[PDB]
């Protein structure tokens, strides 16, 4: 299995981590580079492939049992390890991730967005997430048991996927969120903007491998006027 | 070493 | 250009229409079948590639027989709609990659998203009533529409369009649900507009199910085999 | 013929 760390400590951790993952798991598009910056293809693994994500730093000046499990085809998180007790919390459309040497709780509730929203009593849309509100997502995390998610857990869930899974796949997202690593913990709000890259990764994910030369391309409504406006955007898409 | 879009 | 029809005439030409379609484009899967039914993946073809629908049967008698679809082949997608009694291909901005040979290619300010058209159309899909009278008036909207902006009609029309052949083709419960409107009024439900936002994480997912026990994409549960082939027609090749 | 899903 592959092991990550995203490490929070400063936005120069933050980034690096990011990149150090991206290289790792997907390979640069030959059309849409520019310096060392390109979109990259998720490499192909075997159907049920999962890789683990060490979440360190959340206070610069502890904190150190939290893994997130990621599905590497489709950068989506299956469900969060509490690496004290030894168990993963997976989530109902992720049964088919089999993780060996820790106790599997198999919980009744899906990953979507909609039925996270709905639990955390939360609209993505307008979000914020700060230092402050990482760690005490941490710690609702390491206090969470049983097999059904709660407001808290669920709030926790929405904060790390945007920060970790939809930060990797998307660099407008990072370099938003960045901000808020600062040592003055500015609050970084999800806009309406960020919410619908996410909600239409599979449609950019197809077009991009297409994308030759330079201009435009659009998908929906998202468009991109040039080869930086994406670079500036995407960082990593499905490999389809 | 960074990116310019990082 | 490949070419097929989708007969409105009763229930059993508009199924009759929708099956001989999944045969041409899309490949069954051998582990989702149950005797004549199957989910089918979409057969893969270099980028780009299109096909047209010509729609029939709408009413009595030659009469609105002028309409035809332009359709993406590997995602499904509506490019935009051909009147071909003016020889106009009408196509949508996020589509300037369709290039249809000998007809006017009038490239429209207005995208293809469901956001963009339920926008200009002043309409929810979740709720909305589509009957063989609602699709004879799209009809006329479409081929009374011109110019390069999406109207509050033209965009209901294509609302309504796409649900009926795109989405039908990719969902047997969406076209289950609306066949009776041929022989009633067909009332899209939410759980219908959940399954076509779903489309490609269902797609994802279906091609590694095995034997038989359930299948859970986000909300979207299937407990057995039945309840996919009730379901799902026809997914996407990744 | 029709299937019994259609
Ligand atoms: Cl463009
Ligand atoms: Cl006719
Ligand atoms: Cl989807």
Redo the contacts with the bound molecule.
């Keep these: 299995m592959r092991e990550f760390t995203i490490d929070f400590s400063t936005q120069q951790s933050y980034v690096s981590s990011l990149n150090s993952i991206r290289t790792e798991i997907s390979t640069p598009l030959e059309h849409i580079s520019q310096g060392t910056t390109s979109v990259s293809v998720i490499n192909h693994t075997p159907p049920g492939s999962y890789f683990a994500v060490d979440i360190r730093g959340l206070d610069v000046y502890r904190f150190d049992h939290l893994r997130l499990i990621i599905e590497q085809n489709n950068l989506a998180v299956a469900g969060f390890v509490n690496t004290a007790t030894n168990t993963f919390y997976r989530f109902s459309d992720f049964t088919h991730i089999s993780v060996p040497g820790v106790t599997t709780v198999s919980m009744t509730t899906d990953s979507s967005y909609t039925t996270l929203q709905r639990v955390a009593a939360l609209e993505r849309s307008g979000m914020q997430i700060s230092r402050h509100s990482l760690v005490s997502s941490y710690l609702a995390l390491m206090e969470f048991s049983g097999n059904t998610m709660t407001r808290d857990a669920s709030r926790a869930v929405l904060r790390f996927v945007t920060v970790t899974a939809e930060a990797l796949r998307f660099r407008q997202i990072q370099r938003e969120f960045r901000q808020a690593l600062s040592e003055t913990a500015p609050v970084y709000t999800m806009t309406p903007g960020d919410v619908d890259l996410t909600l239409n990764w599979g449609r950019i994910s197809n077009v991009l491998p297409e994308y030759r030369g330079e201009?435009?391309?659009?998908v929906g409504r998202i468009?991109?006027?040039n080869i930086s406006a994406i670079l500036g955007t995407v960082a990593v898409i499905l490999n389809c | 070493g960074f990116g310019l879009f990082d």
Aim: glycine fraction near 14%; charge should be neutral.
């Design positions: 201009d435009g391309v659009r468009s991109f006027n």
